[PDB]
Symmetry: C2
Subunit: 68 residues, 2 copies
Amino acid sequence: SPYSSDTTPCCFAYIARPLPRAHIKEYFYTSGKCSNPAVVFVTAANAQVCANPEKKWVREYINSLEMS
Amino acid sequence: SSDTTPCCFAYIARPLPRAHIKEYFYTSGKCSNPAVVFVTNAQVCANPEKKWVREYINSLEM
């Protein structure tokens, strides 16, 4: 492919109910260019689910993922 | 939905090789920048104002 994707994933809504923990592969902080400072959890179906960084579960989820 | 929305913060500087273009779409209005994303697999941001962008889109529809 002569070109790689260059779109930027942003968030305009946060998932209300905590995400099934196991069904998560990675996470990443949306770009500072986006309008909302969100958290993104990548599901096993490679879906990119937006989450609120102030949420208790997200906070726990972020720390778990970065610890073997 | 509650899924990420692809937005653009830059536009490619030259026309994409036409034969590689499969489909296209206008990024959500929620995005701060208006843009057309050409799809090949790969998603390339482009300026909705350029002639080749508008013309590529016309060719695609037809």
